Amino acid sequence: SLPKGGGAITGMGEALTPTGPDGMAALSLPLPISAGRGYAPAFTLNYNSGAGNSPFGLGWDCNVMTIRRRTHFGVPHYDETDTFLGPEGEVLVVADQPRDESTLQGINLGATFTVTGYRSRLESHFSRLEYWQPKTTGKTDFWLIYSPDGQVHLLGKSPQARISNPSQTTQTAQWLLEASVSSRGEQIYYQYRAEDDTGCEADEITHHLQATAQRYLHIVYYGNRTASETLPGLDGSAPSQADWLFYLVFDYGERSNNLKTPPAFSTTGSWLCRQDRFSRYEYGFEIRTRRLCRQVLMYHHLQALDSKITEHNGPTLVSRLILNYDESAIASTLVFVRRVGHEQDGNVVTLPPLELAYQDFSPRHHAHWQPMDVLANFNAIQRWQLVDLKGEGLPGLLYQDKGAWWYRSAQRLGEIGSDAVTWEKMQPLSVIPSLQSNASLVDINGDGQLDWVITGPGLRGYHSQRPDGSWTRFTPLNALPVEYTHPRAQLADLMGAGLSDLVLIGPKSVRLYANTRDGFAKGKDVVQSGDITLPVPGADPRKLVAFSDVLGSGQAHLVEVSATKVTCWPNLGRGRFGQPITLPGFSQPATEFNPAQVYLADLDGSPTDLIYVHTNRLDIFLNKSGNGFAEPVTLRFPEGLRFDHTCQLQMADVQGLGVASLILSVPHMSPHHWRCDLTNMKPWLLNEMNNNMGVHHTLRYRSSSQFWLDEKAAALTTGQTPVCYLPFPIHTLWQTETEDEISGNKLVTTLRYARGAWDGREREFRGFGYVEQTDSHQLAQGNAPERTPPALTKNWYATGLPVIDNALSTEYWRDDQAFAGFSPRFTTWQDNKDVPLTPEDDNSRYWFNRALKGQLLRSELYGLDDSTNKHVPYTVTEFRSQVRRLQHTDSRYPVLWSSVVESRNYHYERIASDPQCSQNITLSSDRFGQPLKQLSVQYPRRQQPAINLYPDTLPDKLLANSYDDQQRQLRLTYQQSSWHHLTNNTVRVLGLPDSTRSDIFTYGAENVPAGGLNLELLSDKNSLIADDKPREYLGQQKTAYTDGQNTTPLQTPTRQALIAFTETTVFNQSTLSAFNGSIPSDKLSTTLEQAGYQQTNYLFPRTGEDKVWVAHHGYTDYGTAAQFWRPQKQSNTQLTGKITLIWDANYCVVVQTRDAAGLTTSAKYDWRFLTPVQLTDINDNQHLITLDALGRPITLRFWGTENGKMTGYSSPEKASFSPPSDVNAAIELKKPLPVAQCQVYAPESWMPVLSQKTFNRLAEQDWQKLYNARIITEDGRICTLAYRRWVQSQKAIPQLISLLNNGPRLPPHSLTLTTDRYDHDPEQQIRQQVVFSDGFGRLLQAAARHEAGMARQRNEDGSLIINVQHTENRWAVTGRTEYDNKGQPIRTYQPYFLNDWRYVSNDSARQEKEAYADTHVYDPIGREIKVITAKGWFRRTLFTPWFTVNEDENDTAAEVKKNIDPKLYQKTPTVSVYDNRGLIIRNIDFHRTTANGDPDTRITRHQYDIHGHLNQSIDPRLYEAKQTNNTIKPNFLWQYDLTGNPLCTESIDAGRTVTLNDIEGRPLLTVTATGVIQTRQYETSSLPGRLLSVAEQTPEEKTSRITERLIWAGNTEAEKDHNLAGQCVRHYDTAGVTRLESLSLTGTVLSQSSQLLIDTQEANWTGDNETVWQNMLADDIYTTLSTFDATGALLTQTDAKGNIQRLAYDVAGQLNGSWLTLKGQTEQVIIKSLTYSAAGQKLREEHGNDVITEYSYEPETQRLIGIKTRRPSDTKVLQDLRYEYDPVGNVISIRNDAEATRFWHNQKVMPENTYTYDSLYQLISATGREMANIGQQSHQFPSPALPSDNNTYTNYTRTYTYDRGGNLTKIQHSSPATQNNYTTNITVSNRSNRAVLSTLTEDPAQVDALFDAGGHQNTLISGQNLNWNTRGELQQVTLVKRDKGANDDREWYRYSGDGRRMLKINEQQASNNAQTQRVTYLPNLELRLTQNSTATTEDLQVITVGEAGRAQVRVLHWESG
Amino acid sequence: GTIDGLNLYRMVRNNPVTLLDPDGL
């Protein structure tokens, strides 16, 4: 339910959005919004490099679903002619025809509205819009949205939720969205906030009247307390706070903004006015924006959610999101984001803040004049223009030389990739400019659209009666009001008779000169207007009249420049001009002013600025967001210069950065032309980020104009000429530096754009047709030199222009054997079928191809390494797009749908000859976009090429072995689907699944056409998917929908779309054939339905098919609409009972769940987060957790009932515990603690935290200055990003800080404690664990304290000392891993022990050499290709399209030059061969024993059928025997059903097993290989369906025999006290019954019992009477009760005879000592102390015998090298084993440095044991020592060497021989001294793996008789028969058969249900001493009983302490004998 | 079943000194 310590708070992870096509810079930030009932607003804080200013700052946005009028034209006419934009921003078209309605959602409206449906021309989400206009005037209009998922959105009905013109209330521009409702009944209501004059200064108020149109999102209501399908607020009433549960509030400075007080919902505060006040001015009226969002708060209705608490203040804040800004008068930018949560106690806890940084404008440290050596030959210094004519991207030199116009476009200068720009040779420009008249428009080279306007004295219509200088000049038309072509209103009177000259004063600013104005000859300095007249340009010669956008709106506003004031008349469209706007801040002397020295140019790139030219300098004036100018910025001219009217100064973007430069021209000085760049990087762009968790980003931008110069240059290296299609520069994102401040690794990504596009018809930006991403890795010093190659991703996108998209197929990677290239598909929609069409006219061509824009066309992945295949791509993918025409009702636009119908995938793996090709095709889709006929295609492998391109370091003929017949197959996975949809005028639900059906085609490789498969080939009549060609049935599925009232499935679902159940095919006729011989024909249908399967007709049936078997699953019962249709009951299948869900009052969460058997689960929640915090389980135990203010578990408690008592962790009322917040103090917390776990979070540790003492050393004003600049937060933290830019800028720091340089810093960590027992006094102590994280949320390491020991040490600076020294706190560090910026682990360190928990700096122990660390290498895909171990060996992997070579450490052991036989393990790597489906079909191995013999190929073949399940498998030896005989059954033949459940397992080793699976996945009927049938019986339909009994019956038996019986515990209180609820109290297995008497809180078995049967009775539990079963048992009752700690570890265990084992645990939870108390005896010590290693393996052990064992581990590999077992009483080494390994880990050496024992007469030396292996790693040779009197190895046990025999030992040597299938075939024993060399042979069968001893037979074809059907050996040896149980179990062994039918020497056993042997009885029929041993196996207890027929001879008890094989201690106890 | 190769009778992958089988699975 909740985290148990395995999770944490999600790392914010704000990765950059790919944004491939448009090339901008993006970002996403999630607002802290509670999902609540499941319906919440979808909002995100979105940064975009192209976004302007907003209520969140420059470049930021928080978009809300809006609908607005189109601003493409000048302004909307607000007539019918205008067009609307959708929420996506697409033009809309009329759907169907209008209608008249007056009732909506059962609410009387008030007028006869005319409803017009609207849909987008390019449809993505298929939503439907309606426009509701009132016919009769007096009421408002609004919109509706019918989403495809049944949602309804109400947009703009209330005046507060729409943007209108304050003058005319009828004019509406943007219909903001008001309310919404889901299909369930959830409601969301948004309340906006209009603009007021509050807070803003008077000059803002007086200048801007009617500033009330702007709307701001204020409060968002959702989580309605009452269900209703009606849009809330449909009447126009205010939202009632009582009606909602959750509130999303956007604050603007009204509430408090401190870390001490929490804001309240109901605020009376004051609005805050921003400095950067601006207006939109695009809809024909001022839209004044003056506010900024300072906080985002989520408030919860606690009083309505939980009735137990009352809200006094009101709705309680749950999550606070602080937003601090960098406020300046020029522009505001968001540079601080922080999540905040206030606790209930008043204290607050905080998450690390997010810092952003943008580029600044410093024109005094970055600008100095430089001469342009390029223009030395340029002799024209007076008249020329620096303007971009053609639209290439950069302004060219426009001049006329010798009376002829010339133009020199821009050109790259020098090395490609350098921002240096120069100009080319002059070009004619044949279009004579003097042709046209004055103030006329001329085109360029005869281009389509008229671009520029010309004004020349020699032209016609020119009358300048008072000019100083004049010449023919050009100007950009876009720099003027669009209505210039035909002026209206003020523009018609201002221009008047005509315009004489148009002169630029900037990039888009134009100076105006009015012609001699006829009709009014006086020509005064003013012309009348509605609002205090307008001036006339040129008339008043001391004032400047120009068209300049000084307001930053997007329109050429009118500007009048005077000596003391600026006056701006804003543009409102259609030649209208608003009232004057006095712009203060600028003022110059009235005598010295000259307008020729005034220039207007945007220099900051934010409103145009003002520059005034003087003789020796110039002064600049930054525009403060259209609200004035700041103080002048004086920039000195070049030294020794006097600027006059003869010189020139032009403002142009020579850099292409979007900001103007200073182009100087002087006649007399040399060089004549100068240049000064005020900035080399575009400002006000986000380029730096840091989350203060260790991650720091860095963005870098490059202009698109400079990319065009590079693409032109590279295309100039070839004999061709490229064309540019991007007129205006776009500042595309270029590089993204990701730096980890913890690991030092950098990730510099590089992006490259080309083939830019722009649409001249729709004035939109389509995007680039090629994007080149390149990601490099640069690691820190000390790392491995194996640099991972930087990948390369070449992506081609369709720009929508046929000129580019056609020619983009050249830059591709060519391939002679490639398939047919993709061309777009243009179809129309006629009669519910796509009819293809060739484009009709050039207008139709334009619309179709435009729909293709933004679509990826081709993707190639390259690896950039030094390898020979570097020019070859890894994967290649390309998509085919389709544009479906939908309607032709409108003459302007048609409606289309853009989709990807065909995708293709290539897996070359840098091997061009042999690729892996795959392709998915959509044959048809419905009218709404849902697919109807999909098809997956796996292509066959190509013919083996004549030229092998694979590397030549591969083994012999491995490439020839990589070819299988399964690879050469064409596989067509054809699936059909049907969909439901509700098409109605007020209901719209789309994409509802109805039914599916999958088939698969199987054709040979010759059926593939030359060009490949396409949609046209498959639409034919003879195509490979025609309805007459055969196919294979894969399955079918159908979804059943209920209305919520009755379970009967209906024909068409409802708007709520409730799903009744899911039907899935499982069987057909062909799959059922696997039951022949195991199930009859009559009882098959009866038993199949008995399991729950049902029959129904085929979905999409064909001729001759009927009645597949299906299974219904997923049953759910839903409530009424008044409960939001929340599910009440759910069920899996028809065989198990339902579970009942009890929801809360508000129907938000589930509080109680009554299970099928009546057991309940109660949950108590916390309503700040709606997550469970206190759960009551089935046994009525209380589990409790407490949370922090952010939802992070801090404590864990539990208590309950054990044995009836009430024990547990002390409740918060029994004992209260204050959760600590400091990490160092929580370590120093001692026993006791009443919590199970105590979590301490410290995520802000990476930020320096100064002490309060040095805080006093720093005065208040000194802190006031730092706290003002946001470099230090209100708490004791220092901002990392703000510090770095504060040491760079204002370099002298006015305060010294001793914490930045090194000091105590740590990565984000968190502490975790864990108690082991309860309050009543235990050993206890605290289990402490410290986990470290990084900026990406990856575990750096984990530290665990131990009790005591010796260990290395850590220095206080973060470095590691290799010397080991004793310390109090062991603090073992495990899982030490170094990650790059992509998540792949590049270094892994072995565990170790060091004092303290603080992190060790990475660069310290990077190349420490003593710290052992592995090195990993990865490919661009993410797969591991090279792993270097600590010793130096490296296992490697080679990826190919059709196989994968895996070389172990011995395989690469030869290539280590930089064990015993490095050449032996050469070229023996495991090779797994894949098919086209990606399934392993071959596993290739290489056998080799000598360094010269070439290897044997061990081929194992697995065959997959067309369905895809493992069909057959054959080992190498049967493959070889099959190549001579194809009638040999393979090792395994499996049959499955359609889902994949194995029905039949036909194995030649273990017979044939048939099993019938249930619908829930339960074993119903199992037929074994011998013929025995096993039937299992479960509970009724109204129960969880647990097992009740298991019945078995052999072919010889006639009636079944119940061998297992299950009895489950009831719900009674007496069983909850022992925690028995839901458990099986009594289990009647075959041996005896195991009874569960008690359980613990942690679920561990407190007390249980076992009772065995009588030997003369079989386990057969007939009837339903439980008493007759207890009559077959024995009087002996073996009860084992035990006690446990809180961590589920065994403390004490009591055997059946009364002995107790005590187990104490250490602080680390590892056993540190054992005790044993015999009954009636004292507690003697078994294990004294126990110390462990770093990796948790046992290190040193001392037993109760006072003998100490020492273990030694290889520190490089953590492998056990030595075992020393000495006894310190006499200082004698009893055993000193020392192992040695090979690089894989095979044991090759076992030496003994211990002197031999006294048993061996005259023996002091122990010879070495050595071993050799083959490549398959089978044991070949072994040299051990055997005692002399062993003789030949047999089943007979040898005789011990007594100390009086003076026995000796001699060396032997064995050599083993192995079958090619793995069977051992011979053991060559040889001892040279004892001269007893023998040979043991094993005859292996010819058709199986059954092999017996040679003495049984030497015939291969006779061994299968010596085995039963099931694979069990029926004869152990000659004269010893083995009988077997019905469960494949060894029932009885006959040792010595005796004749005359007598009873013989025999042994027999009895096992439990899980197979554990509980009984063993051996019998001897000797005449002298007829003894019968009886051993009873119990938990840690053996009961050995020997009995004569006369009396009882011996009673022995064996007591075991510990697990077997791990230093177990045995205690024999004798009662008698 | 086929959890330890295809030899249903092979012992610890024929590497008895290095490996071991705890429960016989």
Author numbering:
A (entry chain A): 13 to 618, 620 to 1471, 1482 to 2040
B (entry chain A): 2133 to 2157
How does the study describe this entry?
Tc toxins consist of three components: TcA, TcB, and TcC.
However, it contains two small β-barrels, which are known to be a notoriously stable fold. To prove this, we determined the structure of TcB-TcC-TEV to a resolution of 3.7 Å using X-ray crystallography. However, the electron density inside appears already at a higher sigma level, indicating that the encapsulated TEV is indeed more rigid and ordered than the native TccC3HVR. As folded proteins do not fit through the narrow constriction site of the translocation channel, the formation of defined structural elements such as β-barrels in the cocoon probably results in translocation arrest. The two abovementioned cargos violate this prerequisite, with TEV containing two highly stable β-barrels, and Cdc42 possessing an amphipathic C-terminus that associates with a hydrophobic binding pocket in the cocoon.
